[PDB]
Design an enzyme around this catalytic site. Structure first.
Site, PDB file in Angstrom:
ATOM      1  N   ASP A  91       0.817  -1.232   0.000  1.00 16.64           N
ATOM      2  CA  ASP A  91       0.000   0.000   0.000  1.00 16.64           C
ATOM      3  C   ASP A  91       0.841   1.268   0.000  1.00 16.64           C
ATOM      4  O   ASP A  91       1.322   1.721   1.052  1.00 16.64           O
ATOM      5  CB  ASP A  91      -0.873  -0.060   1.249  1.00 16.64           C
ATOM      6  N   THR A  92       1.022   1.871  -1.189  1.00 20.51           N
ATOM      7  CA  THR A  92       1.868   3.069  -1.231  1.00 20.51           C
ATOM      8  C   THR A  92       1.236   4.249  -0.500  1.00 20.51           C
ATOM      9  O   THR A  92       1.935   5.220  -0.201  1.00 20.51           O
ATOM     10  CB  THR A  92       2.161   3.467  -2.687  1.00 20.51           C
ATOM     11  N   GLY A  93      -0.046   4.171  -0.187  1.00 19.19           N
ATOM     12  CA  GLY A  93      -0.726   5.240   0.532  1.00 19.19           C
ATOM     13  C   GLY A  93      -0.638   5.137   2.037  1.00 19.19           C
ATOM     14  O   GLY A  93      -1.099   6.035   2.760  1.00 19.19           O
TER      15      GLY A  93
HETATM   16  C1  LIG Z   1     -12.612   1.864  -2.225  1.00 15.33           C
HETATM   17  O1  LIG Z   1     -11.869   3.068  -2.451  1.00 15.33           O
HETATM   18  C2  LIG Z   1     -11.116   3.379  -1.365  1.00 15.33           C
HETATM   19  C3  LIG Z   1     -11.397   2.793  -0.131  1.00 15.33           C
HETATM   20  C4  LIG Z   1     -10.652   3.165   0.988  1.00 15.33           C
HETATM   21  C5  LIG Z   1      -9.583   4.038   0.872  1.00 15.33           C
HETATM   22  S1  LIG Z   1      -8.497   4.324   2.222  1.00 15.33           S
HETATM   23  O2  LIG Z   1      -7.967   5.708   2.157  1.00 15.33           O
HETATM   24  O3  LIG Z   1      -9.189   3.982   3.501  1.00 15.33           O
HETATM   25  N1  LIG Z   1      -7.220   3.314   2.155  1.00 15.33           N
HETATM   26  C6  LIG Z   1      -7.481   1.916   1.944  1.00 15.33           C
HETATM   27  C7  LIG Z   1      -6.544   1.076   2.835  1.00 15.33           C
HETATM   28  C8  LIG Z   1      -6.516   1.671   4.247  1.00 15.33           C
HETATM   29  C9  LIG Z   1      -7.034  -0.379   2.907  1.00 15.33           C
HETATM   30  C10 LIG Z   1      -6.086   3.876   1.428  1.00 15.33           C
HETATM   31  C11 LIG Z   1      -4.898   3.902   2.407  1.00 15.33           C
HETATM   32  O4  LIG Z   1      -3.710   3.811   1.626  1.00 15.33           O
HETATM   33  C12 LIG Z   1      -4.926   5.187   3.243  1.00 15.33           C
HETATM   34  C13 LIG Z   1      -4.850   6.452   2.386  1.00 15.33           C
HETATM   35  C14 LIG Z   1      -4.646   7.700   3.255  1.00 15.33           C
HETATM   36  C15 LIG Z   1      -3.462   8.412   3.132  1.00 15.33           C
HETATM   37  C16 LIG Z   1      -3.241   9.535   3.927  1.00 15.33           C
HETATM   38  C17 LIG Z   1      -4.178   9.942   4.868  1.00 15.33           C
HETATM   39  C18 LIG Z   1      -5.347   9.192   5.012  1.00 15.33           C
HETATM   40  C19 LIG Z   1      -6.322   9.710   5.872  1.00 15.33           C
HETATM   41  C20 LIG Z   1      -7.644   9.748   5.449  1.00 15.33           C
HETATM   42  C21 LIG Z   1      -8.637  10.262   6.289  1.00 15.33           C
HETATM   43  O5  LIG Z   1      -9.911  10.276   5.828  1.00 15.33           O
HETATM   44  C22 LIG Z   1     -10.841  10.787   6.797  1.00 15.33           C
HETATM   45  C23 LIG Z   1      -8.280  10.733   7.546  1.00 15.33           C
HETATM   46  C24 LIG Z   1      -6.946  10.696   7.975  1.00 15.33           C
HETATM   47  O6  LIG Z   1      -6.628  11.164   9.210  1.00 15.33           O
HETATM   48  C25 LIG Z   1      -5.270  10.938   9.580  1.00 15.33           C
HETATM   49  C26 LIG Z   1      -5.963  10.183   7.134  1.00 15.33           C
HETATM   50  C27 LIG Z   1      -5.620   8.137   4.145  1.00 15.33           C
HETATM   51  N2  LIG Z   1      -3.826   5.199   4.217  1.00 15.33           N
HETATM   52  C28 LIG Z   1      -3.912   4.577   5.404  1.00 15.33           C
HETATM   53  O7  LIG Z   1      -4.989   4.096   5.781  1.00 15.33           O
HETATM   54  O8  LIG Z   1      -2.777   4.516   6.132  1.00 15.33           O
HETATM   55  C29 LIG Z   1      -2.697   3.822   7.360  1.00 15.33           C
HETATM   56  C30 LIG Z   1      -3.178   2.377   7.277  1.00 15.33           C
HETATM   57  C31 LIG Z   1      -1.227   3.759   7.862  1.00 15.33           C
HETATM   58  C32 LIG Z   1      -3.522   4.599   8.386  1.00 15.33           C
HETATM   59  C33 LIG Z   1      -9.307   4.597  -0.361  1.00 15.33           C
HETATM   60  C34 LIG Z   1     -10.111   4.331  -1.468  1.00 15.33           C
END
Ligand SMILES: COc1ccc(S(=O)(=O)N(CC(C)C)C[C@@H](O)[C@H](Cc2cccc(-c3cc(OC)cc(OC)c3)c2)NC(=O)OC(C)(C)C)cc1
Ligand SMILES: [Cl-]
Ligand SMILES: [Cl-]
Ligand SMILES: [Cl-]
Ligand code: NA
Lengths: 99, 99
Positions: free
Chosen positions: B25-27
């Site tokens: 997961d690059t995100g």
């Molecule tokens: C179906 O389409 C999608 C479903 C869910 C996501 S996501 O953002 O929840 N995620 C899916 C993963 C978690 C299975 C993308 C992730 O790469 C996410 C992308 C990402 C990157 C940067 C910030 C936030 C973020 C989003 C928020 O939304 C409210 C709040 C927030 O607060 C810190 C941070 C989200 N990063 C992330 O969850 O990182 C940790 C696991 C380490 C927490 C994206 C598109």
């Protein structure tokens, strides 16, 4: 380009004529951007992340440029601190993960 | 390998003597694994994303084999809906995004 991951893989996007920064996110199925107005009708959608599920607005067939590459596809709009480019548009710009 | 993004980029990992499936997961800044026991000290952390924050345990200097490549780094353990390999370990296996 070839982008390493020592920092967040942030790129510039252009949507609705506006420049914004967004994250190239291989762990996101769909693209999710911060609240903004987009043309046309939207449909409801639920997406699940690290903390649980939320409601977003689904807009289809939206024109968006990503790091200089033109894409046209579905954009979800919801309350997030970051614009996230997920796999539905990473595939349109030809992105792969390599190691 | 070169991994396309038509589907979720899932790989086999080995952690704590256990084989698991995880999402590259690059995100994700950090690596987050579903509830399991790991040896050593840990401290609490809050991490947030779509849907809000969750509480996790932070373990440092944990070894993981990711699709056959060994890496060491911090691993967060908590009620995540999916095992996530984030950038702290992606860098160690030399993963890049290319388009
Ligand atoms: C179906 O389409 C999608 C479903 C869910 C996501 S996501 O953002 O929840 N995620 C899916 C993963 C978690 C299975 C993308 C992730 O790469 C996410 C992308 C990402 C990157 C940067 C910030 C936030 C973020 C989003 C928020 O939304 C409210 C709040 C927030 O607060 C810190 C941070 C989200 N990063 C992330 O969850 O990182 C940790 C696991 C380490 C927490 C994206 C598109
Ligand atoms: Cl266990
Ligand atoms: Cl680390
Ligand atoms: Cl490097
Ligand atoms: Na440790």
């Amino acid at each position: 380009p070839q982008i390493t991951l020592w920092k967040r893989p942030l790129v510039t996007i252009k949507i609705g004529g506006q420049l914004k920064e967004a994250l190239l996110d291989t762990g996101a199925d769909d693209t999710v951007i911060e609240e903004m107005s987009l043309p046309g009708r939207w449909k409801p959608k639920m997406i699940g992340g690290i903390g649980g599920f939320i409601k977003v607005r689904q807009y289809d067939q939206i024109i968006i440029e990503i790091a200089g590459h033109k894409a046209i596809g579905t954009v979800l709009v919801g309350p997030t601190p970051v614009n996230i480019i997920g796999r539905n548009l990473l595939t349109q710009i030809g992105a792969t993960l390599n190691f």
